[PDB]
Ligand binder design. Sequence first.
Ligand SMILES: Nc1ccn([C@@H]2O[C@H](COP(=O)(O)OP(=O)(O)O)[C@@H](O)[C@H]2O)c(=O)n1
Length: 394
Amino acid sequence: RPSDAWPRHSAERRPWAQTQRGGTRADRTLRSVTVSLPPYIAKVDANIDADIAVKLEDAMSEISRLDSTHLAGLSTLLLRTESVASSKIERVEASVDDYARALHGGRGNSSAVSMVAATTALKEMIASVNRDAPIQMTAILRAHEALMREDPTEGQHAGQVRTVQNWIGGSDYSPRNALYVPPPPDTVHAYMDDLIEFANRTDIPVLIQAAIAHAQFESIHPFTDGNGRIGRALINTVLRRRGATTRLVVPLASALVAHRERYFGALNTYRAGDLRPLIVTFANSSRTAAAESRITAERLAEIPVEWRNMVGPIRRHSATDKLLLLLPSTPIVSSDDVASLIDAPRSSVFAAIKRLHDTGVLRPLTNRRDQVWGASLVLDELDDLGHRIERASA
Ligand SMILES: Nc1ccn([C@@H]2O[C@H](COP(=O)(O)OP(=O)(O)O)[C@@H](O)[C@H]2O)c(=O)n1
């Protein structure tokens, strides 16, 4: 097979019947559906073009320099930036403060709860790998469980592969006019094993492996719901499993979210056996995400200096110094949390809070009582990174 060629998907005609009656008549009389059958890739090789190798290489240059930055706050921020962007791809959205409240346990905004869930699902899936530990099917199921646990009427089977026939697009009530039909459920176990073997290889360039592992995951589409968010989480798991990263996540979903149809497009093209758009999308996305994350690392470091110009003189060991010290790792803190977390009298801690509030370091996220506080510059860097990455995707 040529350069950037890949074994293409085949089709097969399966019987299909509506389990839940509704839709139009055409949905109800439909008796047959054409499923796509992805290749088995665990043993496949891919030779790819030079211009693409350079692009992958330039992405890895940035990914490597990002991962070698020695910093408080950075790792958590990047993880959350990726999760927020990955959720935005499935139109699960909320404001910065909605999300900050949800990170602290707030539950009134179900979108922000899901955004926090996708954050857990990525954090736990990456935690499981290259402690010489391979990518395991257990971590994928646990990540899906973490994401879909509190989901309404969708999290009924959180943590289990689908047992029914799904499809993407077309009719709401049948696979009529679907743009893609994943393989039948009785083949998902055979396919995930093949993928998990493929995702554990060490004889492929890391970005190519990540990129094809994602596309293949999306082609299998093993879950009833959530395949975008868990499938994208697998990208950074492969990065971490190969040592391509070690201490931080690459937030490429912020680049993907900026050109969504092109991303979905690379999945269609993968299925037809062309690797070039998938890998170019992955190389450009990773390059932009890592480059801007590096600038975010500088800016995060400039922030404490910014904070204390604002707050004025601070005594070298007061509460105000103790507090100002911890905020970079922990930018979302309640008054009772801070008082707990600082060795100092609980009412001189409550003074440092008021001082940081009055100087503009802290902003209130709750009225409540046990007021929850957010480091504004940290919360706004979270948001500025995402805009800068979307901007730099041309
Ligand atoms: N032509 C397309 C378009 C999207 N997709 C993937 O399907 C993901 C959506 O996941 P999903 O089908 O589980 O829907 P949700 O349950 O996450 O809302 C997208 O984020 C893409 O990765 C695909 O495989 N082929």
